[PDB]
């Protein structure tokens, strides 16, 4: 048995369905968005959307519709899963707590049935008398609602029409009436039925069938005033009410078919329509006194390619895209002088179909960095994904040996931090940093012969400096020092602390309390404590008066974070920490709920406690080990709240989201000191000092993985990285219409240089395919090599072949003509990128499509239509065949480890091939004889093979242990719920063995890694118990959700740990944790789950 751990690094982003309604409350207007397995609930505020909840279904949401049965206060939500789990959900808010209660649930899958072509349609009667589900051909499943079920008992009605295109419930009907388009050999027709729940059968509909357009593909039910339906086809829009028959043929909609629709009004006088090009049309119904006069279509503008769209209010439309970023657009009454009424308000990042991606060590760190071919036709783009927060440096000054940083406003009138004071060993250095210009000057009032333990701006338009000997209060406006306090015994200051009002300095084992007043430094509270001082903080939080009432200290030889009462320096609270390393940093900060005290040691240990403004008592102790070097903590107020920064060899930005502290990484080498800085040119900027220089960067999102976007405006297909050339080779594809004409300026057409394939081998809308060379710093298209007419570039590899030292871009192509179904022609082209040009080094005519290419020990292993053949790169610089293997239906996916090749077939699923070099040919080692249709394959170890089957499943094969040695055994099975497009070794970070990222059609980036038998058993037990405790939204069983599922097979999962389910072990309260860990202690399992969470 194999032991694998699958977890989600990036959650699905493709919006496959969105509805609006009154779900969270009768008065709120909610936008519910279904990303593949996630249900996101938002609130439609006057501006933008306010998220309220995000829940995970144990299912791919296929259907999602809101409905308000009679007497119900607010809308209930019906969700059907791809595995046909039905549920009716209600939103119940009880104070702070939020719940999504399952009012009903069931599984509506018929034991057999041809799942319909057009797909799962789930419709609700506008009077909420039933839910109609079209799941299989020839059947129409009904879930009655007037009979309040809790099991959602459903019964099939045989539908005599077997190819149903679309179906809706009509409005204004005494009885439930369905209207559907169906295709019979004689054409497409619109028909109606009356659904009789008591007789449980169809009856004659109100209005007889009508013969409609050949590509009539959508039905729109029109509300009560008009009634009837509008059937949108490829070329025409027609309305049927039974006696009235309107029809229009607007030429503007002929270019592309309309795929989604939405009712703007409650009376359906206006409908939004989105087509596959991204255009947004407005379909208007002109009433007459009421009947309907005529139909009009007007082009509103362009949006992302919409899978679904919803009208929220006030002209605001949500454009939910599977292929591009989802959008929040505004509809202006008047055009924008470019003919468009659409104005994009907000964009939601969508890693679209991740068709390919590579893990690259950009900037030469030890951190991986995903680059993905995301998106599609117009929404294509390269997304660059990295962990951490983002340095975003703007300037630097090489200043070796920094030991202090504080922002200063040298100019009195300005409130901006336009000066920086620095301490290195024994002196003070000032920097002006006026705007973007940085220079080293001296500011009046500062001693350049003594070290600066502390300094900062304070009230009364005053500055203050705490040096190693005295404290100097600089009167910025009038003149130089006028108030100065020196310790009576002339003892040096060991530690300092200060805020905008007061001061607390540590001299030896004694503390002095000073309060800053105009032209005065008054000492009030003093004591000589048990041991030496280590660290201090008196920063006011929730000040509201001007003074902090508390103090935090760290002592020597009694290692503990102690608290004191400021006016008297008495001992308030003690928490013992221990260890042989003194505390280094103590900070107190508000994180979104209340006051926390952050205390750190010299070994990277850091303790955070919950502090009270009355007692000063540390409660709910929790410990975290960050870094292997001492740490200092500095506070910077970002847009949202205060975000403390931890400075060490492992820099880490600390803040709190959703009332919980999280440790987001910063991915530069090291940070000794930091301080906030907001100069006239640098907004909300940082100043990260290390041993050498001071990098001055801002931070974007301080939370999750950051996603850059490089819009290509054309569909990317493949991507490989050439380290030697410092570029990405990206196969791209754009649609040209006519000889041919580009529909828009794409990235291929806007390259620095360009070229076209001039080949002697081969002699509506068409796809032009290009090879883009993209700079790995600026992400500009350095070059665009267009391929032959009607040539589809499929594969692309960067490698060195044979013995020569040049690194090549090798592309496998195919010749696509409309008269044929499987290409008979294609070529392997070898490019070399040098001198900013892309020369054609070689070519090789093959007799099929080159679906896949991998470099294989200095040889080129291509997959021509059904043959996997190995090429040698000769000294003459041409490809020469070495060996072939022909026992494939279609070898689509190739992977390599050593001498072993894993061939993923279109429908025979995997083949372990070995290149025996001593003989010089392939040898079929083993094969999996199950009929799995692959979407990707990968080799985890020498004898474990991950594969992705097209029904959203993962399986692992294993070379067994006679002729049964040629049977790969499926030792792992797991229903991912995603269509994996690509596997790749690598990790997005600096217990588990190996690490394989994978990207999906819906935009999930997941991570597969191997576990040992002990941890696998432990985590499997945890998984079972978590299933026993955690309650799913649709009351779906996790085992059923993750069961390997195909149209001809269903087995429980095995060999796979749902990492998402495990990592949910942290988001539950302590009693529930105890319930989980009944039969070692809970903290052990916490340690385990954090160690698991660190891998992504």
């Amino acid at each position: 048995m194999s032991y694998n751990y699958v977890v989600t690094a990036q959650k699905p982003t493709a919006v496959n369905g969105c509805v609006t309604g009154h779900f969270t409350s009768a008065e709120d207007l909610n936008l519910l968005i279904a990303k593949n397995t996630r249900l996101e609930i938002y609130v439609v505020t006057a501006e933008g959307l306010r998220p309220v909840k995000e829940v995970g279904m144990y299912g791919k949401i296929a259907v999602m519709e809101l409905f308000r049965p009679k007497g119900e206060s607010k809308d209930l939500l019906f969700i059907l899963t791809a595995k046909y789990n039905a549920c009716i959900l209600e939103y119940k808010q009880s104070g702070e707590s939020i719940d999504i209660i399952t009012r009903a649930h069931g599984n509506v899958q018929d034991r057999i049935g041809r799942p319909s072509e057009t797909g799962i349609i789930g419709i609700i009667d506008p009077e909420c008398r039933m839910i109609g589900l079209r799941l299989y051909d020839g059947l129409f499943k009904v879930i009655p609602l007037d009979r309040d079920n809790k099991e959602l008992k459903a019964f099939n009605i045989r539908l005599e029409e077997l190819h149903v295109i679309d179906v809706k419930f009509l409005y204004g009907c005494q009885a439930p009436t369905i209207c559907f388009v169906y295709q019979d050999p004689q054409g497409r027709h619109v028909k109606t039925y009356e659904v009789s729940l008591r007789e449980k059968e169809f009856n004659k509909g109100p209005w007889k069938q009508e013969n409609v357009e050949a590509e009539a593909s959508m039905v729109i039910a029109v509300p009560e005033p008009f009634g009837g339906a509008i059937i949108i086809g490829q070329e025409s829009i027609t309305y049927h009410n039974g006696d009235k028959y309107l029809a229009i043929a607007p030429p503007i909609i002929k270019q592309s078919t309309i795929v989604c629709h939405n009712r703007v009004d409650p009376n359906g006088s206006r409908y939004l329509l989105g087509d596959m090009e991204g255009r947004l049309f407005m379909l208007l119904l002109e009433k007459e006194e009421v009947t309907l006069k005529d139909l009009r279509v007007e082009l509103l503008g362009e949006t992302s390619i919409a899978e679904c769209l919803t009208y929220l209010d006030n002209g605001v439309v949500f454009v939910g895209s599977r292929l591009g970023d989802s959008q929040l657009v505004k509809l202006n009454v008047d055009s924008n002088e470019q003919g468009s009424y659409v104005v994009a308000m907000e964009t939601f990042t969508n890693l679209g179909p991740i068709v390919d991606m590579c893990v690259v060590d950009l900037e030469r760190q030890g951190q991986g960095q995903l680059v993905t071919c995301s998106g599609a036709f117009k929404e294509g783009s390269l997304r660059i994904i990295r962990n951490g927060i983002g340095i975003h440096e703007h300037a630097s000054i090489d200043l070796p040996g920094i030991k202090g940083l504080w922002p200063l406003r040298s100019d009195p009138n300005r409130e901006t931090d336009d000066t920086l004071v620095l301490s290195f060993v024994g002196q003070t250095r000032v920097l002006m940093l006026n705007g973007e210009e940085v220079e080293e000057t001296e500011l009046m009032g500062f001693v350049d012969d003594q070290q600066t333990f502390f300094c900062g701006n304070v009230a009364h338009q005053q500055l203050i400096q705490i040096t190693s000997a005295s404290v100097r209060l600089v009167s910025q406006e009038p003149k130089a020092l006028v108030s100065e306090w020196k310790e009576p015994q002339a003892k040096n200051i060991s530690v300092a602390s200060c805020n905008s009002s007061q001061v607390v300095v540590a001299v030896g084992r004694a503390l002095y309390y000073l309060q800053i007043h105009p032209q005065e430094l008054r000492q009030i509270s003093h004591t000589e404590m048990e041991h030496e001082v280590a660290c201090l903080d008196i920063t006011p939080l929730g000040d509201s008066n001007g003074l902090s009432p508390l103090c935090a200290i760290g002592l020597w030889t009694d290692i503990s974070a102690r608290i004191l009462k400021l006016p008297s320096f008495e001992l308030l609270h003690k928490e013992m920490l221990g260890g042989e390393i003194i505390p280094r940093s103590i900070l107190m900060t508000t994180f979104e709920s209340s006051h926390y005290l952050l205390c750190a040691l010299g070994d990277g240990a850091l303790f955070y406690f919950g502090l009270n403004i009355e007692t000063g008592l540390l409660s709910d102790r929790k410990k975290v080990t960050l870094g292997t070097q001492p740490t200092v903590l500095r506070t910077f107020r970002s847009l949202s709240t205060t975000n403390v920064f931890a400075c060490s060899d492992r820099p880490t930005v600390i803040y709190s989201s959703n009332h919980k502290l999280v440790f987001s990484n910063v991915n530069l080498k090291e940070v000794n000191y930091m301080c906030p800085l907001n100069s006239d040119g640098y907004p909300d900027s940082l100043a990260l000092a290390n041993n050498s220089t001071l990098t001055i960067g801002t931070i974007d999102e301080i939370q999750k993985l950051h996603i850059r976007t490089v819009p290509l405006y054309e569909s990317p297909r493949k991507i490989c990285y050439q380290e030697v050339s410092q570029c990405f080779g990206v196969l791209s594809s754009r649609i040209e219409v006519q000889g041919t004409t580009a529909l828009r300026p794409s990235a291929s057409t806007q390259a620095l240089s360009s070229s076209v394939s001039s080949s002697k081998l081969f002699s509506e809308e068409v796809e032009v395919h290009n090879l883009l060379i993209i700079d790995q710093h600026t992400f500009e298209v350095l070059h665009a090599h267009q391929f032959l007419q009607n040539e589809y570039a499929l594969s692309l590899v960067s490698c060195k072949l044979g013995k020569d030292p040049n690194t090549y871009f090798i592309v496998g192509t195919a010749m696509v003509y409309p008269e044929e179904a499987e290409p008979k022609q294609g070529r392997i082209v070898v490019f070399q990128y040098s001198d900013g040009k892309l020369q054609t080094v070689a070519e090789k005519e093959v007799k099929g499509a080159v679906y896949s290419m991998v470099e294989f020990n200095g040889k080129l292993l291509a997959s021509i239509n059904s043959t996997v053949r190995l090429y040698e790169w000769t000294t003459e610089k041409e490809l020469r065949t070495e060996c072939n293997h022909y026992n494939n239906i279609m070898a689509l996916y190739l992977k390599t480890k050593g001498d072993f090749i894993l061939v993923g077939d279109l429908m025979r699923s995997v083949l372990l091939l070995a290149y025996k070099p001593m003989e010089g040919n392939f040898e079929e080692i083993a094969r999996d004889f199950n009929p799995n249709w692959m979407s990707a394959v990968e080799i985890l170890d020498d004898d474990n093979f991950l594969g992705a089957e097209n029904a959203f499943n993962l399986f692992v094969c294993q070379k067994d242990s006679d002729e049964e040695r040629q049977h790969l055994q499926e030792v792992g099975l797991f229903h991912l719920g995603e269509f994996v497009n690509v596997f790749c070794h690598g990790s997005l970070v600096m217990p588990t063995q190996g690490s394989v990222l994978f990207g999906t059609v819906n935009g999930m980036i997941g991570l597969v890694t191997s576990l040992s038998e002990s941890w696998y058993n432990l985590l499997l037990d945890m998984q079972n118990r978590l299933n026993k405790v955690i309650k799913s939204v649709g009351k779906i069983e996790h085992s059923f959700w993750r069961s390997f599922h195909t149209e001809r097979k269903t087995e429980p999962a095995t060999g796979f740990i749902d990492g998402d389910l495990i990592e949910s072990f942290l988001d539950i309260s302590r009693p529930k944790m105890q319930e989980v860990v009944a039969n070692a202690t809970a903290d052990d399992l916490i340690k385990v789950v954090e160690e698991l969470t660190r891998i992504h």
């Binding site: 493709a14 034991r111 057999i112 049935g113 041809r114 799942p115 072509e117 797909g119 299989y136 051909d137 020839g138 059947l139 045989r158 005599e160 077997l162 050999p185 599977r322 292929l323 679209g352 179909p353 068709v355 599609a376 569909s715 297909r717 589809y792 499929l794 195919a814 696509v816 179904a821 499987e822 290409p823 499509a849 679906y851 239509n865 059904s866 022909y886 026992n887 689509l892 279109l906 429908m907 025979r908 040898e923 079929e924 004889f929 199950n930 009929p931 249709w933 979407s935 097209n950 029904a951 002729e963 040629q966 269509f979 497009n981 059609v1001 819906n1002 149209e1047 001809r1048």
Partner: protein, 365 residues
């Protein structure tokens, strides 16, 4: 195909699209694979073939010589050319071998460990595949033309048996009761087939030109009797309501079980609504059968459009079920074809015939 791959890869089309479309294309390209052979073991014509429903790896074959052969359909050799070797065989020397023609053979659904076979020696023998020994024998008073186990019933394990008697025997493999009879036909029952949709619906076709659907739970006769005309020629039911104008010697439910295909010696194939037995009036043209016994034919599964592969003399005629359009005639046999069985995993067809051969038809390219 590259358009299909791209559309799957980018999510425009459900992967379901590519599966069903490419399976349909493979079926349309179905052709006699001389690149694959079945080991010739039957001394007589092959009357029946059966690929196991789970894993589709092994195939049974019953001949007129009374022998049963159990083949392995997987290419266990590394070459692209291979012979479907015979794993086991109930030969002339097996003590339990059938004395006469094995007319039907069927794997036990839900597991490959058991299979049942009936013969003109008036026996339905149940075999243990592992030991290759009979575990039960049901003697009937009259020779068996067909038997069938329900492919769907997790609950009951009845075998419907059609013999020359006018009665349909139901034999419960769970503790053995071969007394139940469904009466209502008037001549030999040449075909029996359980619905793949409903556990207890059984369609039985007989010599008296009638096809009847029974609910074996019910105690009150046939649910429906298939009528060619649906009422145009209506008579008090004593001689009317014939499914065909001859003997009805073949039955087959479509994959989803919502329709029934019957072929009769009137050289017609008709498609019926399995719920109300209404003739769908699909044409199919002229489907030449003159078999004096049951004619075993199959439908495709998991393709964009359903097909039916019906023995047409010495060829296999392929039609579209719901339009009737004759796709093609697979021509590779030398005598009349008795049975064809569909390997739905790979859109492959195996056809046996009176020429004592089993020919594999594999999609080309």
């Amino acid at each position: 195909m590259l358009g299909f791959l791209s559309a799957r890869q980018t999510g425009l089309e459900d992967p379901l699209r590519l599966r069903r479309a490419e399976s349909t294309r493979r079926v349309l390209g179905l052709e006699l694979n001389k690149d694959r052979d079945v080991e010739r073991i039957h001394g007589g014509g092959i009357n029946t073939l059966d690929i196991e429903p789970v894993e589709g790896r092994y195939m049974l074959s019953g001949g007129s010589d009374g022998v049963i052969v159990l083949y392995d359909l997987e290419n266990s050799s590394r070459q692209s050319y291979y012979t479907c070797k015979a794993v086991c065989s109930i030969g002339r020397d097996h003590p339990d071998v059938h004395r006469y023609s094995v007319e039907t053979v069927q794997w036990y659904p839900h597991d490959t460990g058991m299979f049942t076979s009936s013969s003109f020696d008036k026996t339905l023998k149940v075999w243990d595949t592992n030991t290759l020994q009979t575990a039960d024998v049901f003697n009937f008073e009259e020779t068996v033309y067909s038997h069938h186990m329900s492919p769907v019933s997790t609950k009951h394990c009845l075998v419907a048996v059609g013999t020359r008697g006018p009665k349909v025997q139901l034999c419960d493999l769970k503790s053995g009761s071969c007394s139940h009879i469904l009466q209502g036909h008037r001549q030999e029952i040449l075909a029996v087939s359980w619905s793949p949709r409903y556990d207890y619906i059984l369609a039985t076709a007989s010599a008296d030109s009638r096809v009847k659907l029974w609910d074996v739970r019910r105690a009150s006769g046939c649910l429906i009797t298939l009528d060619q005309h649906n009422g145009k020629k209506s008579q008090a039911v004593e001689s009317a309501n014939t499914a065909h104008n001859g003997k009805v010697n073949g039955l087959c439910f479509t994959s989803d079980g919502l329709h029934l295909l019957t072929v009769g010696t009137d050289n017609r194939m008709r498609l019926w609504n399995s719920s109300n037995g209404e003739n769908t009036l699909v044409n199919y043209g002229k489907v030449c059968n003159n078999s004096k016994k049951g004619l075993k034919f199959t439908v495709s599964c998991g393709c964009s459009s359903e097909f039916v592969f019906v023995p047409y003399g010495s060829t296999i005629a392929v039609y579209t079920v719901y339009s009737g359009e004759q796709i093609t005639m697979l021509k590779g046999h030398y005598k009349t074809v008795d049975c064809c069985v569909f390997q739905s995993n790979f859109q492959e067809l195996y056809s046996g015939s009176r020429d004592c051969n089993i020919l594999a038809w594999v999609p080309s390219l």
